[PDB]
Amino acid sequence: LLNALASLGHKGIKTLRTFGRAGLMLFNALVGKPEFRKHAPLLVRQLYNVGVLSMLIIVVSGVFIGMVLGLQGYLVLTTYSAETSLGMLVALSLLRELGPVVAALLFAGRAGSALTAEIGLMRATEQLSSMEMMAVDPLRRVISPRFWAGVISLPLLTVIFVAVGIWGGSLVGVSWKGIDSGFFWSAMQNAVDWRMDLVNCLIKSVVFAITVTWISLFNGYDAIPTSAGISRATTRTVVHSSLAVLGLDFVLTALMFG
Amino acid sequence: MLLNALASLGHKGIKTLRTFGRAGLMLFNALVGKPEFRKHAPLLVRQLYNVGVLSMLIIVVSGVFIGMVLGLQGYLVLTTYSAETSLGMLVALSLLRELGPVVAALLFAGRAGSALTAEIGLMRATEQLSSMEMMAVDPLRRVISPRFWAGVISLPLLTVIFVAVGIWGGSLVGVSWKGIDSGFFWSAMQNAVDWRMDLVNCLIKSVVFAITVTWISLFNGYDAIPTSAGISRATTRTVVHSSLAVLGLDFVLTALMF
Amino acid sequence: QTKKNEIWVGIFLLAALLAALFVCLKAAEPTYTLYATFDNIGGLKARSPVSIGGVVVGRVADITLDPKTYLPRVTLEIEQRYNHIPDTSSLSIRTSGLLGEQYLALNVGFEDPAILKDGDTIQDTKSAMVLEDLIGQFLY
Amino acid sequence: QTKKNEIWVGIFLLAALLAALFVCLKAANVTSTEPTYTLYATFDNIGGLKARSPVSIGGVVVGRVADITLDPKTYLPRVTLEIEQRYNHIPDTSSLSIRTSGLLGEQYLALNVGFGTAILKDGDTIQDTKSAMVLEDLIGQFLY
Amino acid sequence: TKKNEIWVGIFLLAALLAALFVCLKAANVTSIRTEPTYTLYATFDNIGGLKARSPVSIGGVVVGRVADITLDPKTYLPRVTLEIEQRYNHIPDTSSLSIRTSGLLGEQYLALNVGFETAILKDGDTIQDTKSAMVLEDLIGQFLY
Amino acid sequence: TKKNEIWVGIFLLAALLAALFVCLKAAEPTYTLYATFDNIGGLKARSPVSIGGVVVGRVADITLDPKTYLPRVTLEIEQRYNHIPDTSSLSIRTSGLLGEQYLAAILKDGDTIQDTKSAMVLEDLIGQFLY
Amino acid sequence: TKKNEIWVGIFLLAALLAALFVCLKAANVTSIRTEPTYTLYATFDNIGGLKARSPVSIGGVVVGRVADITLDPKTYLPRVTLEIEQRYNHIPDTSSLSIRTSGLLGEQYLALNVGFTAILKDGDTIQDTKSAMVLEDLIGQFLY
Numbered sequence A: 001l002l003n004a005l006a007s008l009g010h011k012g013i014k015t016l017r018t019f020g021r022a023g024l025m026l027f028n029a030l031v032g033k034p035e036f037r038k039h040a041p042l043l044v045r046q047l048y049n050v051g052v053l054s055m056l057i058i059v060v061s062g063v064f065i066g067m068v069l070g071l072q073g074y075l076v077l078t079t080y081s082a083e084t085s086l087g088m089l090v091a092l093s094l095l096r097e098l099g100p101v102v103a104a105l106l107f108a109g110r111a112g113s114a115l116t117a118e119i120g121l122m123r124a125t126e127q128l129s130s131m132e133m134m135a136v137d138p139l140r141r142v143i144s145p146r147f148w149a150g151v152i153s154l155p156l157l158t159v160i161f162v163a164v165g166i167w168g169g170s171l172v173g174v175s176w177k178g179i180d181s182g183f184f185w186s187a188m189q190n191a192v193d194w195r196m197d198l199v200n201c202l203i204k205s206v207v208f209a210i211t212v213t214w215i216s217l218f219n220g221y222d223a224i225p226t227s228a229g230i231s232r233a234t235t236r237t238v239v240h241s242s243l244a245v246l247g248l249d250f251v252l253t254a255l256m257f258g
Numbered sequence B: 001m002l003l004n005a006l007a008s009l010g011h012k013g014i015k016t017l018r019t020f021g022r023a024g025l026m027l028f029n030a031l032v033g034k035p036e037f038r039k040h041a042p043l044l045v046r047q048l049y050n051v052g053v054l055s056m057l058i059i060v061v062s063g064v065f066i067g068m069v070l071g072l073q074g075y076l077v078l079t080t081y082s083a084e085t086s087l088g089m090l091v092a093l094s095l096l097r098e099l100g101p102v103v104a105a106l107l108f109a110g111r112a113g114s115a116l117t118a119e120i121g122l123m124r125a126t127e128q129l130s131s132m133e134m135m136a137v138d139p140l141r142r143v144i145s146p147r148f149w150a151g152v153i154s155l156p157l158l159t160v161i162f163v164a165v166g167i168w169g170g171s172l173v174g175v176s177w178k179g180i181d182s183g184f185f186w187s188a189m190q191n192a193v194d195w196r197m198d199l200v201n202c203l204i205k206s207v208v209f210a211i212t213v214t215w216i217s218l219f220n221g222y223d224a225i226p227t228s229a230g231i232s233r234a235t236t237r238t239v240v241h242s243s244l245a246v247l248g249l250d251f252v253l254t255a256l257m258f
Numbered sequence C: 001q002t003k004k005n006e007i008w009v010g011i012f013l014l015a016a017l018l019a020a021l022f023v024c025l026k027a028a029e030p031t032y033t034l035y036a037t038f039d040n041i042g043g044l045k046a047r048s049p050v051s052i053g054g055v056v057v058g059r060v061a062d063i064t065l066d067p068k069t070y071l072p073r074v075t076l077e078i079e080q081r082y083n084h085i086p087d088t089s090s091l092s093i094r095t096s097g098l099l100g101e102q103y104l105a106l107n108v109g110f111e112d113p114a115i116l117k118d119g120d121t122i123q124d125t126k127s128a129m130v131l132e133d134l135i136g137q138f139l140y
Numbered sequence D: 001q002t003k004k005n006e007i008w009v010g011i012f013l014l015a016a017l018l019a020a021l022f023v024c025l026k027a028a029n030v031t032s033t034e035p036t037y038t039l040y041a042t043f044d045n046i047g048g049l050k051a052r053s054p055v056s057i058g059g060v061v062v063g064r065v066a067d068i069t070l071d072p073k074t075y076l077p078r079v080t081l082e083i084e085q086r087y088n089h090i091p092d093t094s095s096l097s098i099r100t101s102g103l104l105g106e107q108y109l110a111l112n113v114g115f116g117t118a119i120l121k122d123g124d125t126i127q128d129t130k131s132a133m134v135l136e137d138l139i140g141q142f143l144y
Numbered sequence E: 001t002k003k004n005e006i007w008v009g010i011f012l013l014a015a016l017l018a019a020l021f022v023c024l025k026a027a028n029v030t031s032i033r034t035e036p037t038y039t040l041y042a043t044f045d046n047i048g049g050l051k052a053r054s055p056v057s058i059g060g061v062v063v064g065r066v067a068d069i070t071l072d073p074k075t076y077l078p079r080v081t082l083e084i085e086q087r088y089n090h091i092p093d094t095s096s097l098s099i100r101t102s103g104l105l106g107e108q109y110l111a112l113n114v115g116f117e118t119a120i121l122k123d124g125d126t127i128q129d130t131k132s133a134m135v136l137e138d139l140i141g142q143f144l145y
Numbered sequence F: 001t002k003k004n005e006i007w008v009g010i011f012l013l014a015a016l017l018a019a020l021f022v023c024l025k026a027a028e029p030t031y032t033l034y035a036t037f038d039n040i041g042g043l044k045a046r047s048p049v050s051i052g053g054v055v056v057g058r059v060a061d062i063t064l065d066p067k068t069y070l071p072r073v074t075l076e077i078e079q080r081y082n083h084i085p086d087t088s089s090l091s092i093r094t095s096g097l098l099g100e101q102y103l104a105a106i107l108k109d110g111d112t113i114q115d116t117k118s119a120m121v122l123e124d125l126i127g128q129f130l131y
Numbered sequence G: 001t002k003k004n005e006i007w008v009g010i011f012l013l014a015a016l017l018a019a020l021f022v023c024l025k026a027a028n029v030t031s032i033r034t035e036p037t038y039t040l041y042a043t044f045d046n047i048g049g050l051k052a053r054s055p056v057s058i059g060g061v062v063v064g065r066v067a068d069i070t071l072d073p074k075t076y077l078p079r080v081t082l083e084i085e086q087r088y089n090h091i092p093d094t095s096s097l098s099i100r101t102s103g104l105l106g107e108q109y110l111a112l113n114v115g116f117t118a119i120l121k122d123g124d125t126i127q128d129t130k131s132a133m134v135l136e137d138l139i140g141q142f143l144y
């Protein structure tokens, strides 16, 4: 009983202090003195490597998922006379489940792995320890502008993923296979409604932006300062975010959509 | 301008062409040669743990999260015609055509794709690949060859676990929760799926996606610079180049077979 | 310190995120649990709503069956806000729209100038109507 | 460099604004809320009416439905509806019918006008209401 | 070794009590836990779209399933197999079986109609009063001609 | 080699315009009329008006007048179809099951179409069969 | 090195048990049966929406499929093929060929009727047939 059979230990005390270390990392980086003019060039500088550089893997991949949504939405509606409802399948899928979940997996892959590697390289070269010595807090210097950049980028990148994926379905649905444009957009404009498809797409995009950025900034801060600890925390960022985006996707659909 | 824009675009054209030339010579010098089935037999099972066994945790608990979301979204839009004999189609048909081998490949490129890049890149920085070729057989057929064959076996095998759990995960929001007379759930879902369209065709996409993911995952860790920042840079490029190779070939295989 | 300062924050943060999922998963007014007796419920099942006047007033808990009578029984529940119904209240199974879900309906009759409470049973009922016996008795 | 980071941020905000306008024009949002007055009417069976049900006179929607209330004395469905200030000239002889949009669509609260002339104002009832008939009494009345 | 005695063991009892979920098809109700059913037989003329695992209901409450559909090699008539549980035994010989549809894609089920009292049915008898399924090709053609 | 780098620069730009020409190839005024329909049904804007069967235009935004409470069913027939006689009319035809309907002197400018045939709702059509 | 060999055996066992969940519970591919069937020949005049792999039936239970449907370019008569297995080889010569529909929105199948005796063998044609239902002629004959 005292050995590793029942009271094995290092599982209730361990992996619970890391939750307390992640809570103190976000509370001390968001609650403080208001410095708006100081963090104003830091927010624009940290918006290029978070929102602008992650726009490459969304535009060219938005037409990839948007075209296969129109390919698979054609042959399954042949014997049901649902050819005029071609935008019924493309728009409703890319606004409820596809979209804010698929872009969060691309945000955790590109921007999530880069934020872990950036803070992890600063602790390996002791940049955060040297910044702390010169009478300033390293928490509200590099973590706080990186958090607010990743929060406002993912809803601003989801609407790009939606509009490209809808246009990706228009290049394979309206141009190809001969479907009328008057019958296509009538199944999208006055068919779906507000507060179920538009607001709820932006509600879950904010909560996915907080959870991915909190994981990516904690693994880069709570890591071993060596050459193998940065590569280990980069792998654990994608694992912990894919189980948090897909895990909360079943949680967030309890209230909305029936 | 004519001597400056053509020289800058011409410099990136040769470097792109030299990138594919080094990837073709790395795969050709790792598959052919003398048969070493008795030496690579303890090396293949050793590399089957961090590729197939360690990536089973990211698929099993996420497999019940895919089917619970897909089973709940595909129910309330089908109650307008018939609640019974639903959720057998549009769940198992979707998890064998688009979902399945695409969704498991983003989990394979994030967990196992980013780990195989960081493992070869860490051995290159610590001078392990150069030390092996200076005294024994070169590591192209010693550490790269068991890591390439382990990815083309585990990812077709892990897709079957992702399908069968996600099918059972869709049978939890339909059975014992807003029940749809689960005797009608079977003996009609089997009539929709068949061989060489949904079962064998899912295995075709699994072998193709396993080659294009493990090729970039073993090339970025081999072509990275031996430093602390080159391993973290090649880890980010592995998730980027594999997401454009899975979603890019998803349009290729859908228009060819379906 | 590093051990005492970070052990109590993880207690409160894990208890706040776990309690947020308890509220989000809809895990949160009395009824008097009427009982009925029909012969063909049709497409009725558990968690089916009961309506009067078109809008719903409650839900059906479960559908049981007695082995001595071999007739389906309903365990519907209507709240305390609507009580003044007579004993001649007819129960009818109606369909929401054309191909929607089936629901119960309370056809309130003429009140003679008794109320239903715990343990009562609606006498006048009308079961669901299948489309098999109607076409077989019309085009024949 | 330094000038490359400042320009590409504004292009990212412009591309996200044009992608949001594609949802504000080519999606469920078609436009870019004046207070109405509340009516009261008693029915017998509203069918499948819910919140934000469209009220139309001839086909053009003139308002929504706030909530569905009930009578604690006679147990009859009381529906509240809102008409705009521009559509004010409505007589008392008005049939409040409940029809559906097509065959399988959602139900809409229909309304038609009918020609000492008293018109409807804020806070009055309508005596001519047409209840939504269920599918049960259509085949049963056709046979009997 | 001081705090890993009872402050950690309360997480083991909390995870063991939360390690059980609802499972009617994984490992509980499919093979091990079942109900004792007796085998019945019924000979039909046209079953329509009747398949395996179809519910046999009396009014709508499912009391059994359907095992398989076999054909006799002498008269070529479909013979279904019933899975009525032992909780409902008082079934007379005057009971009739009616194949009714439920849906629009040709999904028919068996609606058992009990009789009024006779003899109690046992394991391995055959009900004679069987009704064929409704076909749309004979429904519209009877109205014209 | 700087000489071989600029030689391949014009070779890749010649294939860029050829690969982009196959994707851009697949990616008239309208004079307005007037209609005085009573029951428009479930007809909305941007509906394909096919008089005879082939589409000729669309429908503008519908609204009710404050005088007689009647919807405006103004139309957008383009210039390729102009030899239509004045003895024509329009009819509201439905298409599908969701309720999406469509429509079917000189008329160059300001043409009030007479002989209005409104959409017969099925909720009132069952009263004729029952009574 | 024993930990890196046992867990691989559970990984190949869990991947094998996932294959039996698809090949048995989610589909029926457990038997190949080496195709024990024999083809026939038939001629209709209007097959309607009869497509490939059309399941013929005797009394509702499904046995035998349709392999090839061709059009004979001599008098514009379509020719279909039925592929019942070699088990119920007692078919009377008075058997007809009717085209039925599974319910209301199902697939269009072929129903075999039992007649009142030349036993049909491999390589013959069915004389007495029956066409499908035409939707434009019932609405024209109803008002005529």
Ligand SMILES: CCCCCCCC/C=C\CCCCCCCC(=O)O[C@H](COC(=O)CCCCCCC/C=C/CCCCCCCC)COP(=O)(O)OCCN
Pocket: A069, A072, A073, A076, A080, A081, A082, A085, A088, A089, A092, A093, A094, A096, A097, A098, A101, A102, A249, B065, B066, B069, B070, B073, B074, B077, B089, B090, B091, B093, B094, B097, B098, B099, B103
């Ligand atoms: C009665 C027959 C019905 C049809 C049966 C055959 C259907 C076959 C469909 C399967 C094959 C095509 C699959 C296409 C891809 C589907 C994937 C998908 O839908 O998205 C899912 C989730 O599903 C959704 O996105 C929600 C879709 C909501 C659909 C809303 C209704 C659409 C209406 C279309 C029908 C029109 C109904 C009107 C009646 C007319 C037709 C009868 C993704 O889940 P995630 O967890 O986000 O994945 C993360 C990793 N990528």
